[PDB]
Coordinates of N, CA and C and ligand atoms in Angstrom, one line a residue:
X1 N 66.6 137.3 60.8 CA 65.3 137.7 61.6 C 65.7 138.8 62.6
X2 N 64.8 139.8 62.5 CA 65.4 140.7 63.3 C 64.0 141.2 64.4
X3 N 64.5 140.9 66.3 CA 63.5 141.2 66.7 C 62.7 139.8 66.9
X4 N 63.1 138.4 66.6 CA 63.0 137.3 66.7 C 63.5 136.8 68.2
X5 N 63.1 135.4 68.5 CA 63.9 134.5 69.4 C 64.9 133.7 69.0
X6 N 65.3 132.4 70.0 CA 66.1 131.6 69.2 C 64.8 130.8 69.4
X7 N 64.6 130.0 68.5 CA 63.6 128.6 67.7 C 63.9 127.4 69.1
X8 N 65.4 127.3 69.1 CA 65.4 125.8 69.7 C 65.5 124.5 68.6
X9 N 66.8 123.7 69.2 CA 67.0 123.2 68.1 C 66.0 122.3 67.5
X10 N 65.9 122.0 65.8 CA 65.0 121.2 65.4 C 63.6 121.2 65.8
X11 N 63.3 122.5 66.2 CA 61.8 122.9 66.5 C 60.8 123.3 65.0
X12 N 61.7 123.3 64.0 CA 61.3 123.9 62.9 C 61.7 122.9 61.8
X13 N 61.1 121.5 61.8 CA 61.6 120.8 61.0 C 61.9 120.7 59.2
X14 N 61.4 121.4 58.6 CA 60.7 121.5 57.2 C 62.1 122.6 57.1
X15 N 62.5 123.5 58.2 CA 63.9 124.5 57.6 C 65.0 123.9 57.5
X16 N 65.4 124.3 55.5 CA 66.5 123.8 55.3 C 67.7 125.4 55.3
X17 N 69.0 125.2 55.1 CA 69.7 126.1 54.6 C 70.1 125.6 53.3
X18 N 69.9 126.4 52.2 CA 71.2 126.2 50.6 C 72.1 126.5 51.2
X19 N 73.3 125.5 50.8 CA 74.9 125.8 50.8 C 75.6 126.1 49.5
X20 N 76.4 126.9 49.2 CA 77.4 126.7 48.3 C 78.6 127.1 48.8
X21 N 78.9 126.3 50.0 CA 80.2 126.7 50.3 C 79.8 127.6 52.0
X22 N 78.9 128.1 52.0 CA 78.4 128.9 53.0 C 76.7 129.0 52.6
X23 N 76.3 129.2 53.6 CA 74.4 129.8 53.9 C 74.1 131.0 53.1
X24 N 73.4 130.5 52.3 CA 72.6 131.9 51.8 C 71.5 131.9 51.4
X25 N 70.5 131.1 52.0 CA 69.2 131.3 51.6 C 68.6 130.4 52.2
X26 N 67.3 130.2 53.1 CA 66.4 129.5 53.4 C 66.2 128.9 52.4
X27 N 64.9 127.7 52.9 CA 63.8 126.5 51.7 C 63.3 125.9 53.4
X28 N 62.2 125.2 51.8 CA 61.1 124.8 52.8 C 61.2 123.2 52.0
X29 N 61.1 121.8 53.1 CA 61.0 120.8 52.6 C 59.7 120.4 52.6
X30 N 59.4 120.2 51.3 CA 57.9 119.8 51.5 C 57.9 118.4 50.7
X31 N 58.2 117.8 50.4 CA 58.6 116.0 50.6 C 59.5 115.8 50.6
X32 N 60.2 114.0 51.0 CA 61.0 113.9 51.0 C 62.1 114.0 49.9
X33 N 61.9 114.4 48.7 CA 62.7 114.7 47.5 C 62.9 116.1 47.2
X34 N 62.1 117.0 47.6 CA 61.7 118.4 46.8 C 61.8 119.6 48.4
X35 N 62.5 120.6 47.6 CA 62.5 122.4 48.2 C 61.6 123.0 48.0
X36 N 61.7 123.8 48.0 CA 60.7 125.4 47.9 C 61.4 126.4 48.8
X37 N 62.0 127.1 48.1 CA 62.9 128.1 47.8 C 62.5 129.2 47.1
X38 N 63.0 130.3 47.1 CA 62.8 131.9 46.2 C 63.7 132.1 44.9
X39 N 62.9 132.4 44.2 CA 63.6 132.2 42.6 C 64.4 133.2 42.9
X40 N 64.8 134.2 43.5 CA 65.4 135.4 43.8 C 67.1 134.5 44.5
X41 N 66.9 133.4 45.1 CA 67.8 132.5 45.2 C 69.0 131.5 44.1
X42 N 68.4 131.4 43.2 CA 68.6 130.4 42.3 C 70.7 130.6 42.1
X43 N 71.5 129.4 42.2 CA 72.5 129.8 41.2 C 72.9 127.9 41.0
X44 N 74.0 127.7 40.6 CA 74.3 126.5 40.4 C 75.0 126.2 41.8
X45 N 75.3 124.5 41.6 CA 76.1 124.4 42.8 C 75.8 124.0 44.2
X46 N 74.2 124.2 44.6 CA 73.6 124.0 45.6 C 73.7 122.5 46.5
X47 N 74.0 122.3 47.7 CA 73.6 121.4 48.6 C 72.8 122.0 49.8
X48 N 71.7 121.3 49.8 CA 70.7 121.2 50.8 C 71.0 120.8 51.8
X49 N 71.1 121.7 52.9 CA 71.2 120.9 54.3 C 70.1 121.2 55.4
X50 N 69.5 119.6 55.4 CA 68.5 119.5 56.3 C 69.1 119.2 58.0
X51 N 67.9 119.5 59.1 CA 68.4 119.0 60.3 C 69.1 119.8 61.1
X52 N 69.3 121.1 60.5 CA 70.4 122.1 61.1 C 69.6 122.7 62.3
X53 N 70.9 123.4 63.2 CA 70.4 124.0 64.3 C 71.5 124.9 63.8
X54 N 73.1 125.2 64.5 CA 73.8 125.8 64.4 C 74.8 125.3 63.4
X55 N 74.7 125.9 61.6 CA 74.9 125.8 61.1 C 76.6 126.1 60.8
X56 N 77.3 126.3 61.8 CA 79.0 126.0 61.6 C 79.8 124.6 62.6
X57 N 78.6 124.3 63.4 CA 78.5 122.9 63.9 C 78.2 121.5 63.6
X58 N 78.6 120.6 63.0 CA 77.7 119.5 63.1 C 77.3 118.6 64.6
X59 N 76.1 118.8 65.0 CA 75.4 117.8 65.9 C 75.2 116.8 66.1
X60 N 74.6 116.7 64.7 CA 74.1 115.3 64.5 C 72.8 114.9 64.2
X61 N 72.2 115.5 63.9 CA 70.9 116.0 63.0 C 70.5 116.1 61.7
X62 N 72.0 116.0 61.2 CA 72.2 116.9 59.9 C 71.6 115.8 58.9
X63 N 71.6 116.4 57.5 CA 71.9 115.5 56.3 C 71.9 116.4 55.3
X64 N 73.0 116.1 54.5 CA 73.8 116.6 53.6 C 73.5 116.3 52.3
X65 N 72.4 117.3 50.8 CA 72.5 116.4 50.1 C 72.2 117.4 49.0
X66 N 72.9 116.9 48.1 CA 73.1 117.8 46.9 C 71.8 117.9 45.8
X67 N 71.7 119.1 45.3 CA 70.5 119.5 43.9 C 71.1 118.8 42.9
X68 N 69.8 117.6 42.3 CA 70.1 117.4 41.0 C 69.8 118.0 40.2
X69 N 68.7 119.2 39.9 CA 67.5 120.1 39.5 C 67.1 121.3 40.0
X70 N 67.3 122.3 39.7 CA 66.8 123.8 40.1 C 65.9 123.9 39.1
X71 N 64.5 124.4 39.2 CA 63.6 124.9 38.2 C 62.7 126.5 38.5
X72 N 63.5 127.2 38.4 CA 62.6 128.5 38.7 C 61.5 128.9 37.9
X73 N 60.6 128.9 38.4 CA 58.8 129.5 38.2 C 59.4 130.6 36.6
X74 N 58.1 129.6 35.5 CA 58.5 130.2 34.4 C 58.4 131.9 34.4
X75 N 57.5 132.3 34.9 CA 57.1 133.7 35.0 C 58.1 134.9 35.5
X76 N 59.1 134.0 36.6 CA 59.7 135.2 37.3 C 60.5 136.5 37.0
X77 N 60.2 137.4 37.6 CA 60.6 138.5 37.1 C 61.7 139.3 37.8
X78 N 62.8 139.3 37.6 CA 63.9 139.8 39.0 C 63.8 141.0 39.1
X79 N 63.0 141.6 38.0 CA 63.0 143.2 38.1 C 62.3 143.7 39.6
X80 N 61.1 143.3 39.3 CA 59.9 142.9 40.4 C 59.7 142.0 41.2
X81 N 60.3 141.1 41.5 CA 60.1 140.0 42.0 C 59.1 139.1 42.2
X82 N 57.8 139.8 41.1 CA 57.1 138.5 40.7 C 57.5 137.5 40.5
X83 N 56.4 136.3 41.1 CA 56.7 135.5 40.9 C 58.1 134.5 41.6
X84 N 58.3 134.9 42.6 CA 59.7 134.6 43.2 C 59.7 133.5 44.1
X85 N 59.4 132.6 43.1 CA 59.9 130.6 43.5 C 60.4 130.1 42.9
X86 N 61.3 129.1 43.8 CA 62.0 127.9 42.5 C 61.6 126.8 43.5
X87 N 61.7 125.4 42.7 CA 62.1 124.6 42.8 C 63.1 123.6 43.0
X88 N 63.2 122.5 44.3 CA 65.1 122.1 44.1 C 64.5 121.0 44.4
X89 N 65.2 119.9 43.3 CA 65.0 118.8 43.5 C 66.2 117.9 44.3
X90 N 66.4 117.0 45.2 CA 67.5 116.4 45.7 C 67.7 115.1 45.3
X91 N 69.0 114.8 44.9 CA 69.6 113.3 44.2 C 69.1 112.4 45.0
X92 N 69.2 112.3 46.3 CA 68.3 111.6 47.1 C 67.1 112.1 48.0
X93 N 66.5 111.1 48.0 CA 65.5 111.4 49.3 C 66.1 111.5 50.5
X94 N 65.4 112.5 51.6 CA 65.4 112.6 52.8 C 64.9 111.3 53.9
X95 N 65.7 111.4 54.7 CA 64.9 110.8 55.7 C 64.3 111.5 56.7
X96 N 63.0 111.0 56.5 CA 62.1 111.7 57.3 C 61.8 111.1 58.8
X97 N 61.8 111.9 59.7 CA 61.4 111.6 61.4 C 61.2 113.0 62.1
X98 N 61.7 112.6 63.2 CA 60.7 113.9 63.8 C 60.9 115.5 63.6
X99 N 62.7 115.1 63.8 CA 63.5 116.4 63.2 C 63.5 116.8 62.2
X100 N 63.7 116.2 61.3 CA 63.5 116.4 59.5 C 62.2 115.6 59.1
X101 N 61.0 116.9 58.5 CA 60.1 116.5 57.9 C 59.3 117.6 57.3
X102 N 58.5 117.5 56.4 CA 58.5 118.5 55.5 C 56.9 118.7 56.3
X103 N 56.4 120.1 55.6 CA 55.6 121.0 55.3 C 54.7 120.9 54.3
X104 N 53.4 121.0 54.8 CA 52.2 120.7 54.1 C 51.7 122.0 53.0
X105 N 51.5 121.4 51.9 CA 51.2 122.8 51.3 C 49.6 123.2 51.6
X106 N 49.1 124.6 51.3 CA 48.5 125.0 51.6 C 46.9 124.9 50.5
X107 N 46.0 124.1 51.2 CA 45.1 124.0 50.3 C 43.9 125.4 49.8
X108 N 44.1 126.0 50.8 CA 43.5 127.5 50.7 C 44.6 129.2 51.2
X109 N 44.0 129.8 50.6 CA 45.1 130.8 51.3 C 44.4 131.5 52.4
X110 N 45.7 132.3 53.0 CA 45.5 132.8 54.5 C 44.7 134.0 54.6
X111 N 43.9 134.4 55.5 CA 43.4 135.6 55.4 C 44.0 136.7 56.5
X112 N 44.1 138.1 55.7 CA 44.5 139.0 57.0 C 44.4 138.9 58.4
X113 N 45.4 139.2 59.0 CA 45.4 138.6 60.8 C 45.7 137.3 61.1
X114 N 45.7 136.5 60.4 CA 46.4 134.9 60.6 C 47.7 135.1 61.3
X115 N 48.4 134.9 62.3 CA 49.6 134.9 62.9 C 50.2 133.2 62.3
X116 N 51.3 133.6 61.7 CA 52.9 132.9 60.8 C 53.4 133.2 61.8
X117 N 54.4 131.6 61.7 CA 55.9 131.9 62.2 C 56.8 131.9 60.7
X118 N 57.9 132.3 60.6 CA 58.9 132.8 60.2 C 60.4 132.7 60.3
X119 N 61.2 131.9 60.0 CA 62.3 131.4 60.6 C 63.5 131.8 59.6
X120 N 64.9 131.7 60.2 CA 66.0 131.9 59.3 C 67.1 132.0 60.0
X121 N 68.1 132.2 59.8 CA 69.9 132.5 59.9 C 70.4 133.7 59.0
X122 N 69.1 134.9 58.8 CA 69.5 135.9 58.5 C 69.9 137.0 59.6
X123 N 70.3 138.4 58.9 CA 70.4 139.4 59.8 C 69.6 139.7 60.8
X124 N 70.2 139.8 62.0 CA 69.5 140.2 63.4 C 69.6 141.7 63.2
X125 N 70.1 142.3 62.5 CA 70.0 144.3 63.1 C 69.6 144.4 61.7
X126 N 68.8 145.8 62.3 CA 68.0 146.7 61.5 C 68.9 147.8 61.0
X127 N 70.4 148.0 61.9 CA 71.6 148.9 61.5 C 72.9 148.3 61.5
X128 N 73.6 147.9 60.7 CA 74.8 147.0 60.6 C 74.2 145.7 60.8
X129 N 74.7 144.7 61.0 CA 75.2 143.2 60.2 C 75.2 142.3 61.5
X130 N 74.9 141.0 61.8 CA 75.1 140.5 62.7 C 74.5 139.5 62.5
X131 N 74.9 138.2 61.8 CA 74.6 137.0 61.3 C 74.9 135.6 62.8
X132 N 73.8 135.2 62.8 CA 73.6 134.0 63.9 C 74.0 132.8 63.6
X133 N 74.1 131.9 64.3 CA 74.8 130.8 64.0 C 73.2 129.9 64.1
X134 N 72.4 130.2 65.2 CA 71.3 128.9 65.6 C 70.2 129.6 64.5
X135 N 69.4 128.8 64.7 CA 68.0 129.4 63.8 C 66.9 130.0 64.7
X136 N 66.7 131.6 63.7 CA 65.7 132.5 65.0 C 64.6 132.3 64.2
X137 N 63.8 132.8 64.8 CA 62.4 132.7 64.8 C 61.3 133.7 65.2
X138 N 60.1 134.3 64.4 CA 59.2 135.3 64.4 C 58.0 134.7 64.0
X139 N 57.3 135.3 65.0 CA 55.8 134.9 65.4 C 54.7 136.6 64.5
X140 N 54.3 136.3 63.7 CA 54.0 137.7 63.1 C 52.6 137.1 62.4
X141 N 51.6 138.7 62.0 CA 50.5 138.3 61.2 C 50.8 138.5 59.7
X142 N 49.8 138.2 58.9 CA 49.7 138.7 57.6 C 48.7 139.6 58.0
X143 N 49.2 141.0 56.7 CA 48.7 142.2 57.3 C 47.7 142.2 55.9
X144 N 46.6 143.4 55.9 CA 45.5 143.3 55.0 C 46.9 143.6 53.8
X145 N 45.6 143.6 52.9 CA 46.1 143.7 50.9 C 46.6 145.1 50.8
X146 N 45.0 145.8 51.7 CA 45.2 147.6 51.6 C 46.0 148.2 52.3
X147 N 46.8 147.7 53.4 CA 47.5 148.2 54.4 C 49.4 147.7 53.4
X148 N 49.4 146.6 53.3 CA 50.6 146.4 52.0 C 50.9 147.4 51.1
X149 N 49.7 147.4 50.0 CA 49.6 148.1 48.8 C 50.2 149.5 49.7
X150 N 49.3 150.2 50.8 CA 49.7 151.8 50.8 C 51.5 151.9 51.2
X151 N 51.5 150.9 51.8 CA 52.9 150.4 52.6 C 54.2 151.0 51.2
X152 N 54.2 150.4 50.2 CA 54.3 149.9 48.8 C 53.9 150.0 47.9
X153 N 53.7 151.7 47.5 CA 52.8 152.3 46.0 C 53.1 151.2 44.9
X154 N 52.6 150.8 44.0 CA 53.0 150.5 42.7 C 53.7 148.9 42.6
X155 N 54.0 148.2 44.0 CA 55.3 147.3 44.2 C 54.4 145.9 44.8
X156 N 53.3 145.9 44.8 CA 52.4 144.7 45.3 C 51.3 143.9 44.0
X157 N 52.0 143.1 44.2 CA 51.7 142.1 42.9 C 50.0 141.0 43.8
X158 N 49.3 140.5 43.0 CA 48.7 139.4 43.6 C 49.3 138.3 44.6
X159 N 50.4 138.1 43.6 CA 51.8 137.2 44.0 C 51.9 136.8 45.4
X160 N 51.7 138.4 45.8 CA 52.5 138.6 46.9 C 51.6 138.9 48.4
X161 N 52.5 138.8 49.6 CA 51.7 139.5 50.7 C 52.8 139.7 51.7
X162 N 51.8 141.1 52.6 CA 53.1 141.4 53.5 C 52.2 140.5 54.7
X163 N 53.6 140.6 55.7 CA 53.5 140.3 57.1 C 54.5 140.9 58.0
X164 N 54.3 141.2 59.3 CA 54.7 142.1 60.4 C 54.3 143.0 61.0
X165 N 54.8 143.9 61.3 CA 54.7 144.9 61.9 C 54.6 146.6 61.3
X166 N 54.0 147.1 61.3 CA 53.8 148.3 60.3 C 54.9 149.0 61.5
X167 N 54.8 149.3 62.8 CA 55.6 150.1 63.9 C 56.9 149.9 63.9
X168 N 57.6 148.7 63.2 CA 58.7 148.3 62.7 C 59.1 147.4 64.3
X169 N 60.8 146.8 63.7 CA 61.3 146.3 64.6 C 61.5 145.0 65.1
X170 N 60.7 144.2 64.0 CA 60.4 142.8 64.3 C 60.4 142.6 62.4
X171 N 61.3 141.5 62.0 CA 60.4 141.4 60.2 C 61.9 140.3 60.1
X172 N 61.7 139.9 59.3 CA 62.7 139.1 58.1 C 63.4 140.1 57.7
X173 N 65.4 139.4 57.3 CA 65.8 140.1 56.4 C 66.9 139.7 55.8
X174 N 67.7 139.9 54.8 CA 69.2 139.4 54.1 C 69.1 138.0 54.8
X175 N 69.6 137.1 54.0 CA 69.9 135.5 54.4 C 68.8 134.6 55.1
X176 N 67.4 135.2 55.2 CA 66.5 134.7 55.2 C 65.7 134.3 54.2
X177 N 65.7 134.9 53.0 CA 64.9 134.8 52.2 C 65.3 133.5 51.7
X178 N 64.0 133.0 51.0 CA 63.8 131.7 50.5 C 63.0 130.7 51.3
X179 N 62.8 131.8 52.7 CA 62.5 130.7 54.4 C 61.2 131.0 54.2
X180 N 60.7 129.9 54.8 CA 59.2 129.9 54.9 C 58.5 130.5 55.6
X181 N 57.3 130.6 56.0 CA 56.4 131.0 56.6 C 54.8 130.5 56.2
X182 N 55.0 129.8 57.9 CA 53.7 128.4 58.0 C 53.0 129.6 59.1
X183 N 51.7 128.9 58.7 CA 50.4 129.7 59.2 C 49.6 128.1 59.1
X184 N 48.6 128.0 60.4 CA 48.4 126.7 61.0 C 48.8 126.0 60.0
X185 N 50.4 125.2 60.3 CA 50.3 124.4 59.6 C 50.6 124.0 58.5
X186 N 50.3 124.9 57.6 CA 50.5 124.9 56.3 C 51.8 126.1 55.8
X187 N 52.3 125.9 54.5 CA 53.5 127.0 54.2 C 52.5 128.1 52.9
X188 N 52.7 129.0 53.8 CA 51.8 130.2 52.7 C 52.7 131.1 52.3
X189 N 53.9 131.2 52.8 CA 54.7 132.4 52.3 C 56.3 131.8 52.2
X190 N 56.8 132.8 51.3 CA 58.7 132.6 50.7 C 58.8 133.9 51.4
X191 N 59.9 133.8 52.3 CA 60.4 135.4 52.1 C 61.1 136.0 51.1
X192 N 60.8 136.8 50.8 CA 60.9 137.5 49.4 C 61.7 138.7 49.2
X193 N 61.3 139.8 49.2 CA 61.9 141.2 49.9 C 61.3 142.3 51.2
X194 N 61.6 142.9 50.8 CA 61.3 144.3 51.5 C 62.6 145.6 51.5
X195 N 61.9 146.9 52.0 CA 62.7 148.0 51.7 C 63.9 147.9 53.5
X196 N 64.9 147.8 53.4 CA 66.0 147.3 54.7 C 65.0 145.9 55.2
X197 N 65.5 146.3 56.7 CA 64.3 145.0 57.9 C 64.3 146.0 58.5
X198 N 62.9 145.7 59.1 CA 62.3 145.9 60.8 C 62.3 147.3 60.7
X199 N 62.4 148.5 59.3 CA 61.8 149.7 59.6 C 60.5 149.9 59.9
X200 N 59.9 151.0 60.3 CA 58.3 151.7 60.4 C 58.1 152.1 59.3
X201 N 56.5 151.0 58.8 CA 55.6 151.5 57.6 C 56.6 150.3 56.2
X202 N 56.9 149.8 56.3 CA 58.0 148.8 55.7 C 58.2 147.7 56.1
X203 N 57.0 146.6 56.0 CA 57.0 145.5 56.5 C 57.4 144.7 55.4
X204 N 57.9 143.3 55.8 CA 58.4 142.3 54.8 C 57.2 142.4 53.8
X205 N 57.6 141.3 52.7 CA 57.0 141.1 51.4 C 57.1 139.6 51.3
X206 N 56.1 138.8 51.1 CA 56.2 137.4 50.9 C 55.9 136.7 49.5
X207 N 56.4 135.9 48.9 CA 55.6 135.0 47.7 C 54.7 134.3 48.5
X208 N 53.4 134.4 47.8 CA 51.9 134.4 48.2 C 52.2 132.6 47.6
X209 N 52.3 131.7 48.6 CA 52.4 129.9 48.1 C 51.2 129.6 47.3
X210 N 49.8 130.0 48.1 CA 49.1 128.9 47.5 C 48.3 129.6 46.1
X211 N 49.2 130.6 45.7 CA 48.6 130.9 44.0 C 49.4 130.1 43.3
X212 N 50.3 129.1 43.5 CA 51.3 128.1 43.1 C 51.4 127.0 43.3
X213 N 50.2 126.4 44.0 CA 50.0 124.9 44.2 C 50.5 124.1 43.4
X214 N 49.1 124.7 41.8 CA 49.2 123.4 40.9 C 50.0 123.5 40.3
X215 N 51.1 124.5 39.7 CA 52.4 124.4 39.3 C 52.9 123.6 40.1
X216 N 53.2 123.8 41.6 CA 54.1 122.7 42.4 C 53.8 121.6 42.2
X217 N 52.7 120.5 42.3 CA 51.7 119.7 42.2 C 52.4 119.2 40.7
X218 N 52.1 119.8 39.9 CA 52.3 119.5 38.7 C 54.1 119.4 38.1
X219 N 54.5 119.9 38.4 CA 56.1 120.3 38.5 C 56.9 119.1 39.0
X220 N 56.0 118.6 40.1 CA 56.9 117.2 40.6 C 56.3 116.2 40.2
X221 N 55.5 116.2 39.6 CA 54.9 114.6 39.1 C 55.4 114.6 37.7
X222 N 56.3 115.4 37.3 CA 56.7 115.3 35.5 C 58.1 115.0 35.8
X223 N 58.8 115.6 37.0 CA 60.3 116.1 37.1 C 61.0 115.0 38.4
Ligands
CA1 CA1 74.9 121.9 62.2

């Protein structure tokens, strides 16, 4: 997150990190068994860690637990990154309380100007590298369809939606993606891509959640 605060710990309960050895990707807990994560994420090997604050510390918050099931959205496209969710099932359930608890899915989608927050343990600079230890956080709107699309000739799917700042300087980026973004409440967006972070006229790119309900919906009641 670049252009973010720090969150504060366990203010953001529903954010997990994927580990394989190290952080590389947000997810969102939305029960106690099941992720939601960016198919643009996917590899073998994954453990979920919920409860984090400063992810090279343990506090005491934590829980540690490994993917029995990755299922990436049949459609997805890496060329394009339509379509860019997966699914992560966990061997066990979570325990859920105040710190660790999942995220409501979204029974309608968001309309332009809704203010999302945004969260991650990605890149803080917009020029060179500088990875955080706590979890930051961005308060940002979803921007219209038409203001995206011009943003991004040819590169805006249904799928998808942007949010931030067209003036740059504030946006999601590298080792965030996969992270959510709740708008009252509910989780409407994956971060996805975008062209760098936090330039002008180059706002993030999100997987649009609730065109994926009933796949989700459907996906865990078989799996
Ligand atoms: Ca920790």
């Amino acid at each position: 997150i670049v252009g973010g605060y720090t969150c504060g710990a366990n203010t953001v309960p529903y954010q997990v990190s994927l580990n394989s050895g190290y952080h590389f990707c947000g997810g969102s807990l939305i029960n106690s068994q099941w992720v939601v994560s960016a198919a643009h994420c996917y590899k073998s090997g994954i453990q979920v860690r919920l409860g984090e604050d400063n992810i090279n510390v343990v506090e005491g918050n934590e829980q540690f637990i490994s993917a029995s099931k990755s299922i990436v959205h049949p459609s997805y496209n890496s060329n394009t990154l339509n379509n860019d969710i997966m699914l992560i099932k966990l061997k066990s359930a979570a325990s859920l309380n105040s710190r660790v608890a999942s995220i409501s899915l979204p029974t309608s989608c968001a309309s332009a100007g809704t203010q999302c927050l945004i969260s991650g343990w990605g890149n803080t600079k917009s020029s060179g590298t500088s990875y955080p230890d706590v979890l930051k956080c961005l308060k940002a709107p979803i921007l219209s369809d038409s203001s995206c699309k011009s943003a991004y000739p040819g590169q805006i799917t249904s799928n998808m939606f942007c949010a931030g700042y067209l003036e740059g300087g504030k946006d999601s980026c590298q080792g965030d993606s996969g992270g959510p973004v709740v708008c009252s409440g509910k989780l409407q967006g994956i971060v996805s891509w975008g062209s760098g972070c936090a330039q002008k006229n180059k706002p993030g790119v999100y997987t649009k959640v609730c065109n994926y309900v009933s796949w989700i919906k459907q996906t865990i009641a078989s799996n």
